[PDB]
Design a binder for this molecule. Structure first.
Ligand SMILES: Nc1ncnc2c1ncn2[C@@H]1O[C@H](COP(=O)(O)OP(=O)(O)OP(=O)(O)O)[C@@H](O)[C@H]1O
Ligand SMILES: Nc1ncnc2c1ncn2[C@@H]1O[C@H](COP(=O)(O)OP(=O)(O)OP(=O)(O)O)[C@@H](O)[C@H]1O
Ligand SMILES: [Mg+2]
Ligand SMILES: [Mg+2]
Lengths: 391, 413, 239, 889, 50
């Protein structure tokens, strides 16, 4: 992530060709690795007959009980239960009733044991790519940047400060405020610069219709996060997962309400927790369940207000990084004159003014682009409130 | 009158300004992302190796014995027996998934141990009984017998000198002195509900009695009772209330019984039907015919208003212990619990801190104790001062509890 | 939850409908005021003329008696009743007792009239806050303030309106214990205080002073422009 | 689509150049005046860079391309003015008249005759007219000429001054970030004759500006971070005179032309050392120019400052040599007893207290080889004045109890207790010296070289350790005497005691470990000349190693001093020297990869890195040259630690996947010493990737291979929270991971991270990036261990006292004459700023704020404020001079 | 987004939050463009109008 000239300079032509040099050599070295292997023994006769000892259509079974005389009991998908033997090379130390095993068809015998057993709905929610830029991308939020770093990055990088006072770091963080402020960016910048793994949850993702399929996916969600790295979980749009827990008249409302009541249990209920951090985000905060807002579950409440006349300059500066800017413009024209508008408004102004230059056959962008752009973006919010009663 | 695109004017744009390094820098970034892919499929080293033992011990088995245990060994199934008839086998056997057969015993059996309701090994071809089995134990109650001590002493539940006193009477005292109840002529209650505001200490009292129990203690995961199949959740209730009768005096802790049934209604003709069958099965094995004897039930909830009056009846839930907020003497004891194990100044007072938390819980007090040390890491200190806690009270409570009353305060001094 | 009544209490002892009246004060234009050695001064901001009206009917600074002033915030309707009522009391006091009216006596009348106006149901309280400035009580300069709850109170430098928290924090680091003599210096303190306006256009400041012996002296936008020039003269020492 | 009606320019410049063949002949006025009316108007419709779409430039050539093909060549009688009207008007649209094979024909309109002063109609326009087109000429057209035919025709002759005025025009029009476009122009034009381009561009830059030097100045050194061998040879010496001739910032000479010492010429920086002795200005820049010249990148400068001004201007030499060294001892004496230091912590051993209740009882460990590691509770913590009377009684008993190699080891630990000392360091040894034993005196007198290491004053050039050496008829008296003095005089390149210790090589007394460390002792001294050392080593190498096919005591020690005597030059003559000198059998051609890449410390020479892979890649090699593929991988570890993190991410990407993944003996035995050589800072990417292969011990191999990778997994200094890994692996490492073999090792790894609170700079990067070695002192250890049997006997000479080039620690002191100032410094996560808007904010981590002797840390360019100007070198270096000036109200 | 209680609707919002997020979630999509057309400008929600 070092393309730091950020412009059409020969350095970025030199830097990226270095990256081309190392990856081509990494290709050619592993190309030589599968080339110059004169070693053949296959399996020195042991695993080769074993791979022929097991059946070729390997099937999947489920343990019920363990009769340890090398002759146990299993269960199929339909529930057909078979007094099968153990056909060796399996240590009887990691097989428990519930752990799924590997079976045959002709004799149904236990050949291996199936590992990791993840239902392929939670593996979709496992992020592999760092999407966007680092903390230097966003346009100045540094009082609240230092807040989220105290609970996520700093306890993982340097947990020597906390043992000197015996204080565990906070676990839950709410991001709340008006829309268009930077909630989704602050999660993506953390997921960029991190060392542990990352999990994203899009709102109504853990909602199904089979009346028990809802809460069952939540158990496997925290199970995967606990079994893997000391990592964090980002669950966004939790306004569709909690509203004050009232009792009413609809029957599909309860399997909604029950799944959202056992997330409470997995979070800060019994046993312990492990090193799992949870980051949650909404637009509205007052319509939530007060059982989730209490500390023990969430220890940080972070406001994201609409910007000022000072850090707004940093918003216009970053979104006008790589565009040909004519020297006629003043950034403080649109900032000081109008004092209402979000950070997502400013990105729309910079894109619209660039469209106005091609609209009148230009490359550079003058003040007259921003005069028409600041109009056209802002005409989507109504005229006003009250008349001059107050003075 | 605004139109500014024509195919000739397209060729104006992509030649003006850095014609030298435009594609020269771009396709270098393009084919390296292609090369990010072409490394990955060239590696291909996924390697989901499992099942295999260390390859230095099974060598004796997979020489001939594995081939000796293919054709002579049997793929026999297990079943259940209804009954038998005299002078003959005449064995009537079901599967509950397959059909019901009437079969013969084999030669390798003793005809005495073919008692009714017994799991037996059954042939696949002629379906003869070969091997009788030990009875089935339920697999998921074994998963939720705790077999583990969570470490919370009664000295950490401060502010609750009387709620523990009520809870000591029901759980601990008949299990250690079952004399004074009989020697006066009373009976102890058998069901205690816990209700009140959240974060008040519901889980702590349940976590602390799992420490000092000297008895069978069963945590019950609440949403395991709700299943996909019809009647499956009601069968899970039964296996729980059978094995409790086997051993003596086992403890069962439910938690958030708001989820497993709160109200019985039917106006739109449907809804939470399967939840009601599991919930009413819980009732009839709680009171009814065959009283349970020595089974103590603890429940805890945050929303006690929305529960069924069938559970509100004493005889099922007998003692209503509620948790409130500690007045002042409770909170001053709570600060001394959660801040004794941290590097503080040895001269500060805590009663001034308990003033400034008027309507607060035990969770909110601990959040102040954790936050005050976080201000010490904002600066460069290793001990907490008085103003560290005073800023932490404004950070936790006053940042969310009041914003109009603090600046415009001049109605009260 | 429970407010919707001026007679009910909260479970933690509050009157939210009284507290909501102070929220209506924060929609008003800011007005500041200090006292000095002899000359008291108060200024208002946010004139914002709209190209088609006469500006002598939008006045926010009035005089109750010959030696007491008034500046307010909130909404314009409720201020007109309080101003017109206070002119009667500061005149009927002179009839019953032949003295002139002190600046302390008229603020207790405004607070007590707003007091009983809060107690009875079906009486919406006044959503205004006022500044009473008068060097009347035997050559002594004073300034008080009010509150929609009905609590008269004395400061030495005051700010109200939309943005009072910045100005009141500004004056604490600016009001010297050195008394601002050479009273154009004290007037330049207010123009420096009102320089932190919501937009600071320069020509939206209406400062009104009183030399404690004459009547009210409304400043013109040529003398006030001279004081805005010398504020930029002292600002040249930053480089 | 509102076309039509206002298409004036697609009609009349569509007709009048179409009437130009209709009015060239038989119309002498219409040939000229309509051309001039075409020329100025097409010139005028391009000068505003606010209409890129030109109503002529992509409207006329639809017929005008076929016109110009019949107007410019086919006229054949071109006048003196009509060529200045044709070529001035028709060389403008030719980048867009023609497609991508324009690159051979930017001349068939232009270079018929370049009309006059082509910037006359191209001055105020940035690049739309011809300046992009000028770069198109220098890209392809000049390079094919200047590939072998630089000295050539008009394509070079006028093109020189044509590129001269264009390079002036980049810093003329707007003076924007197109300043850096001039090195984009100067290096593409005549890539190898860059200096022939730069010599005109040096003098043009000297008269260009004195404020717009510095961002182009750092643009050069960013391009000089990696190049070809000849480009790094060329543009670094072009970099030198710009703060010498244009400006006189000039305090960036000494270290930032140590950049240019080894590549261009060793005497050239000595002529720049002469240029140091020219600009003797005042004292303050002179002071900190010569602060680095002793113990920051090299020593050996104490012979050139005893000339005719020996009062104070040349009496800084001994002050540089040992007094500011002793003022640095006054840091560890005064300032570091003040911050966090009593004489004996001695309690990282005591931090193993909670283990005795973890699982019942304790007191089960009674291994005698743990008592080797018991010396490092006293040994490592007592660096920088951890002086101990009777706290060495754990040493004093175990010295007189058993363990002859530990008698040498505990005696060698006394030199680490008194490090950087000359005042009373020998007096501490003398009371613990006279025991009349072989092992006791050979460890103590080797430690005497450690005490005066970095001093190089008159302590014992041949006094003590030469008299220790001539005592030999026997064991380590023969060995341990030559090692300490070459360790002490490693910073020097003195010839005399090298010739005193050359008959150690010429004795042919066949003690093998003595001759091996003899190559290591002479290797630490010199890096340049004295080819007779290369002669002396290979004579005994051909005598001894030819009559054997055996252990790496031959191989790990004897070619290594050859590589240390020829370290750091990418000339590739040293490979022609060494590899053709030892043309031999392949077990002696193990040494082929040593002196090849020891001259290749750090640069971008990726063509070497592929021959560092492709020759001996895998081959599966049934136990014959497996040492060579490890040592070929050993030389992959360097040429990776200096490219300032550009290849470090690529190094951890390759060596994580390729070897430890799809390897064998190369990966699972040796390939973790990269991480024990790449960085010593620590970060949880590689710090957690090593216990992926360590918690999985993979015990089927001789597991001390993987437990060697345990050992220098803790080869990251600057103490951390890594105690969680080592103590928990020490808990499983007591019973399992047998305490007979590595109970020394895990606690060697445990006790080395908290060596001392401070003094962790062992990582070969000073100022920003220059080497300053540590290489000649470190690299023997990672060459020493990649096997076994030196965990018991022979490597105990090495494993204690191998690397001893720790150069202090932080950048807090002020030294303003009386040394009373402390100032206000502001420490931050390091710079990222390369080219952005004007005043580029230097850093980003504003939270930390100290005043005085605060730590260095991994990426810290610590700045200062409060208008103290800090006008010393403006590049840091931990002995700032800090004058005072405040003329800005 | 209306209130809770037995009013408004949850499930209409449950679908709406996914439309609110598959084009503006953690993963930004490319080369997919949406067109929305309706009257009643002031009564659609102020989270997809941003
Ligand atoms: N402080 C900021 N600096 C720079 N860019 C910003 C900032 N705030 C918002 N943006 C812009 O807003 C977009 C991100 O939207 P944001 O993270 O505000 O969504 P959100 O808060 O999740 O909105 P919603 O709550 O409606 O889903 C980015 O494209 C970014 O360019
Ligand atoms: N009376 C108390 N004394 C000391 N600590 C307390 C007390 N009450 C609560 N706490 C602290 O608050 C934390 C959270 O309390 P807990 O979650 O047990 O409350 P709860 O009533 O069980 O919450 P819920 O009703 O949501 O289940 C506990 O970890 C405990 O440390
Ligand atoms: Mg969002
Ligand atoms: Mg609880």
């Amino acid at each position: 992530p070092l393309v730091t000239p950020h412009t059409q300079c020969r350095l970025k032509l030199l830097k990226l060709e270095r990256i081309k040099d190392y990856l081509l050599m990494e290709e050619e070295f592993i190309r030589n690795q599968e080339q110059m292997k004169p070693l053949e023994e296959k399996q020195e006769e042991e695993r080769s007959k074993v791979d022929d000892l097991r059946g070729t259509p390997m099937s999947v079974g489920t343990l019920e009980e363990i009769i340890d005389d090398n002759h146990a009991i299993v269960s199929t998908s339909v529930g057909s239960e078979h007094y099968v033997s153990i056909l060796s090379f399996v240590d009887k130390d990691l097989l428990e009733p519930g752990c799924s095993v590997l079976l045959n068809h002709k004799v149904h015998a236990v050949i291996g044991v199936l590992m990791d057993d993840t239902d392929p709905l939670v593996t979709v929610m496992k992020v592999e790519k760092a999407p966007q830029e680092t903390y230097a991308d966003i346009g100045g939020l540094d009082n609240q940047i230092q807040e989220i770093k105290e609970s996520v990055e700093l306890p993982l990088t340097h947990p020597e400060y906390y043992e000197e006072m015996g204080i565990k770091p906070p676990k839950g963080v709410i991001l709340y405020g008006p829309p268009g402020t930077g909630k989704t960016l602050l999660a993506k910048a953390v997921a960029n610069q991190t060392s542990a793994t990352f999990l994203r949850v899009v709102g109504s993702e853990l909602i199904q219709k089979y009346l028990g399929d809802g809460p069952k996916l939540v158990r496997e969600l925290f199970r995967v996060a606990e079994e893997h790295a000391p990592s964090i979980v980002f669950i966004d749009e939790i306004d569709a997962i909690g509203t004050k827990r009232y009792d009413s008249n609809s029957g599909g409302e309860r399997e909604i309400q029950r799944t959202m009541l056992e997330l409470l249990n997995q979070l800060d209920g019994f046993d312990s927790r492990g090193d799992v951090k949870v980051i949650m985000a909404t637009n509205r905060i007052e319509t939530l369940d007060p059982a989730l807002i209490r500390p023990g579950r969430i220890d940080r409440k972070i406001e994201f207000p609409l910007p000022d006349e000072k850090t707004k300059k940093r918003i216009f500066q970053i979104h006008t990084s790589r565009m040909t800017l004519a020297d006629d413009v003043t950034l403080d024209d649109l900032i000081m004159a109008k004092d209402d508008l979000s950070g997502a408004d400013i990105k729309a102004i910079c894109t619209e003014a660039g469209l106005m230059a091609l609209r009148e056959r230009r490359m550079k962008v003058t003040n007259e682009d921003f005069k028409k752009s600041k109009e056209n973006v802002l005409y989507k919010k109504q005229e006003g409130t009250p008349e001059g009663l107050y003075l | 009158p605004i139109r500014a695109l024509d195919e000739g004017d397209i060729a104006l744009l992509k030649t003006y300004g850095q014609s030298t390094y435009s594609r020269q820098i771009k396709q270098v970034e393009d084919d390296i992302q292609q090369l990010l892919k072409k490394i990955n499929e060239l590696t291909g080293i996924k390697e989901s190796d499992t099942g295999l033992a260390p390859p230095a011990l099974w060598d004796l088995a997979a020489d001939k014995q594995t081939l000796q245990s293919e054709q002579p060994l049997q793929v026999a199934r297990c079943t259940k027996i209804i009954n038998a008839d005299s002078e003959d086998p005449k064995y009537i056997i079901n599967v509950k998934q397959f059909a019901k057969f009437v079969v013969d015993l084999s030669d390798q059996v003793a005809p005495t141990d073919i008692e009714e309701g017994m799991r037996v090994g059954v042939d696949r071809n002629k379906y003869q009984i070969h091997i009788p089995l030990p009875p089935k134990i339920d697999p998921t109650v074994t998963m939720m017998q705790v077999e583990e001590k969570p470490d919370v002493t009664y000295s950490d539940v401060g502010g609750c000198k009387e709620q523990i006193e009520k809870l000591r009477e029901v759980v601990e005292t008949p299990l250690l002195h079952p004399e004074r109840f009989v020697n006066l002529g009373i009976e102890p209650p058998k069901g205690v509900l816990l209700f009140g505001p959240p974060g008040t200490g519901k889980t702590l009292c349940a976590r602390a009695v799992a420490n000092r129990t000297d008895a069978c203690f069963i945590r019950v995961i609440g949403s395991e009772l709700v299943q996909k199949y019809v009647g499956e959740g009601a069968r899970m209730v039964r296996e729980l209330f059978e094995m409790a009768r086997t051993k003596k005096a086992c403890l069962i802790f439910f938690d958030e019984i708001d989820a497993i049934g709160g109200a019985r209604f039917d106006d739109g003709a449907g809804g939470d039907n399967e939840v009601q069958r599991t919930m009413l099965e819980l009732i009839n094995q709680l009171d009814g015919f065959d009283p349970r004897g020595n089974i103590k039930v603890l429940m805890a909830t945050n929303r006690p208003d929305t529960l069924d009056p069938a559970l509100m009846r004493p005889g099922r839930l007998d003692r209503k212990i509620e948790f409130s907020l500690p007045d002042l003497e409770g909170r001053t004891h709570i600060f001394k619990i959660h801040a004794r194990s941290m590097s503080v100044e040895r001269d500060i007072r805590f009663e001034l801190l308990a003033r400034l938390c008027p309507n607060s819980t035990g969770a909110e007090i601990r959040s102040v104790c954790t936050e005050a040390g976080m201000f010490a890491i904002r600066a460069r200190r290793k001990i907490a001062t008085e103003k560290d806690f005073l800023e932490a009270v404004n950070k936790v409570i006053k940042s969310y509890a009041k914003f109009s009353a603090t600046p415009r305060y001049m109605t009260y001094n | 939850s429970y407010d919707r009544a001026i007679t009910v209490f909260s479970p933690d002892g509050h009157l939210f409908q009284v507290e909501y009246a102070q929220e209506a004060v924060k929609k008003g234009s800011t007005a500041v005021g200090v006292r000095g050695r002899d000359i008291v001064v108060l200024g208002v901001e946010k004139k914002s003329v709209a190209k088609l009206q006469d500006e002598r009917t939008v006045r926010k600074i009035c005089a109750l008696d010959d030696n007491v002033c008034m500046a307010f915030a909130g909404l314009t309707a409720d201020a007109r009743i309080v101003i017109n009522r206070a002119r009667v009391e500061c005149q009927s006091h002179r009839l019953t007792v032949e003295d002139p009216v002190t600046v302390e006596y008229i603020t207790r009348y405004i607070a007590s009239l707003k007091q009983r106006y809060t107690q009875s149901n079906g009486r919406r309280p006044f959503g205004i806050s006022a500044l009473i400035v008068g060097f009347d009580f035997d050559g002594t300069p004073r300034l008080y303030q009010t509150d929609p709850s009905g609590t008269y109170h004395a400061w030495k430098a005051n700010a109200i309106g939309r943005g009072a928290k910045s100005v009141r924090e500004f004056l604490e680091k600016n009001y010297t214990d050195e008394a601002i003599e050479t009273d154009d210096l004290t007037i330049k303190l207010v123009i420096k205080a009102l320089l932190e306006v919501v937009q600071s256009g320069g020509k939206n400041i209406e400062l009104a002073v009183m030399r404690r012996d004459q009547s009210l002296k409304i400043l013109n936008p040529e003398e006030i422009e001279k004081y805005v020039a010398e504020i930029e003269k002292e600002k040249e020492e930053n480089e | 689509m509102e076309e039509g009606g206002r298409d004036k320019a697609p009609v009349q410049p569509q007709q009048s150049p179409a009437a130009a063949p209709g009015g060239t002949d038989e119309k002498p006025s219409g040939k000229e005046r309509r051309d001039a009316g075409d020329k100025d108007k097409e010139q005028e419709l391009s000068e505003e860079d606010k209409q890129l779409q030109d109503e002529l430039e992509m409207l006329v050539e639809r017929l005008g391309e076929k016109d110009t093909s019949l107007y410019r060549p086919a006229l054949e009688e071109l006048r003196r003015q009509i060529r200045s009207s044709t070529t001035s008007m028709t060389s403008v649209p030719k980048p867009l008249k023609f497609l991508r094979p324009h690159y051979g024909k930017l001349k068939e309109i232009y270079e018929n005759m370049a009309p006059g002063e082509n910037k006359r109609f191209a001055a105020d326009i940035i690049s739309v007219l011809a300046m992009t087109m000028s770069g198109e000429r220098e890209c392809l057209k000049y390079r094919l000429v200047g590939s072998q035919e630089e000295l050539a025709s008009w394509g070079h002759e006028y093109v020189r001054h044509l590129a001269g005025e264009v390079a002036k025009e980049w810093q003329e029009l707007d003076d924007a970030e197109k300043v850096q476009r001039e090195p984009l122009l100067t290096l593409v034009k005549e890539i190898v004759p860059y200096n022939m381009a730069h010599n005109a561009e040096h003098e043009a830059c000297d008269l260009l500006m004195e404020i717009e030097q510095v961002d182009m100045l750092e643009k050069d050194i960013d391009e000089n971070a990696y190049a070809k061998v000849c480009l790094y040879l060329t543009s670094c010496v072009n970099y030198v005179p710009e703060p010498e001739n244009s400006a006189l910032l000039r305090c960036a000479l000494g270290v930032f032309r140590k950049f240019s010492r080894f590549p261009e010429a060793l005497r050239l920086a000595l002529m720049l050392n002469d240029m140091e002795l020219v600009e003797d200005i005042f004292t303050s820049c002179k002071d900190v120019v010569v602060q680095k010249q002793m113990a920051f990148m090299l020593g050996r400068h104490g012979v050139f400052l005893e000339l005719s001004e020996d009062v104070e201007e040349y009496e800084d030499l001994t002050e540089i040599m040992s007094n500011v060294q002793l003022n640095s001892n006054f840091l560890a004496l005064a300032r570091e007893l003040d911050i966090m230091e009593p004489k004996v912590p001695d309690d990282i051993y005591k931090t193993h207290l909670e283990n005795n209740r973890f699982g019942g009882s304790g007191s089960q460990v009674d291994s005698a080889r743990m008592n080797l590691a018991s010396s490092f509770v006293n040994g490592f913590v007592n660096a920088a004045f951890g002086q101990d009377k009777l706290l060495t009684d754990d040493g004093n008993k175990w010295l007189y109890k058993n363990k002859d190699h530990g008698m040498l080891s505990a005696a060698a630990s006394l030199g680490m207790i008194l490090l950087w000392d000359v005042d009373g360091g020998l007096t501490q040894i003398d009371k613990y010296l006279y025991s009349s034993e072989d092992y006791i005196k050979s460890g103590a007198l080797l430690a005497c070289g450690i005490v005066n290491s970095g001093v190089r004053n008159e302590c014992d050039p041949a006094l003590a350790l030469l008299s220790d050496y001539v005592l030999h008829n026997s064991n380590t008296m023969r060995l341990g005497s030559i090692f300490g003095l070459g360790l002490a005089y490693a910073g020097s390149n003195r010839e005399d005691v090298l010739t005193l210790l050359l008959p150690v090589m010429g004795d042919s007394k066949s003690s093998m470990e003595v001759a091996g460390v003899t190559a290591l002792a002479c290797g630490m001294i010199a890096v340049g000349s004295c080819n007779g050392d290369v002669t002396s080593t290979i004579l005994q190498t051909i005598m001894e190693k030819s009559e054997t096919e055996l252990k790496d005591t031959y191989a790990r020690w004897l070619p290594l001093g050859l590589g240390l005597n020829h370290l750091g030059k990418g000339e590739a003559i040293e490979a022609i020297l060494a590899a053709l000198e030892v043309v031999s059998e392949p077990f002696r051609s193990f040494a082929n990869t040593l002196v090849d890449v020891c001259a290749y410390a750090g640069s971008g020479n990726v063509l070497k890195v592929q021959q560092l892979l492709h020759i001996c890649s895998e081959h599966f090699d049934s136990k014959e040259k497996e040492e060579d593929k490890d040592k070929k991988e050993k030389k992959d570890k360097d040429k990776k630690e200096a490219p300032a993190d550009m290849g470090a991410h690529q190094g951890v990407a390759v060596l994580g996947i390729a070897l430890i993944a799809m390897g064998e003996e190369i990966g699972a035995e040796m390939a973790l010493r990269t991480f024990g050589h790449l960085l010593r800072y620590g970060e949880p990417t590689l710090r957690r990737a090593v216990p992926l292969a360590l918690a999985l011990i993979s015990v089927s191999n001789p597991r001390l291979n993987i437990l060697d990778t345990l050992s220098k997994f803790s080869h990251d200094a600057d103490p951390e929270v890594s105690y969680n890994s080592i103590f928990a692996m020490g808990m499983v490492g007591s019973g399992t991971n047998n305490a007979r073999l590595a109970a020394m090792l895990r606690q060697l790894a445990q006790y080395h991270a908290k060596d001392p609170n401070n003094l962790f700079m062992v990582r070969l990067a000073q100022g920003l990036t220059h080497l300053g070695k540590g290489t000649l002192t470190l690299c023997p250890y990672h060459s020493d261990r990649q096997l076994m049997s030196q965990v018991a006997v022979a490597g105990l000479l090495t494993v204690l006292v191998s690397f001893l080039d720790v150069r202090n620690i932080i950048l807090g002191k002020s030294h303003y004459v009386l040394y009373g100032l402390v100032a206000a410094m502001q420490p931050r996560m390091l710079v990222t700023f390369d080219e952005e808007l004007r005043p580029l904010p230097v850093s980003v981590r504003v939270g930390q704020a100290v005043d005085v002797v605060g730590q260095a840390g991994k990426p810290k360019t610590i700045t200062g404020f409060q208008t103290h100007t800090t006008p010393v070198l403006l590049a840091h270096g931990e002995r700032a001079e800090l004058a005072t000036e405040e003329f800005l109200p | 987004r209306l209130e809770g209680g037995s009013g408004g609707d949850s499930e209409v919002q449950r679908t709406m939050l996914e439309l609110l997020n598959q084009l503006d979630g953690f993963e930004a999509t490319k080369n997919i463009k949406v067109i929305m057309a309706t009257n009643r400008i002031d009564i659609l929600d102020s989270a997809l109008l941003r």
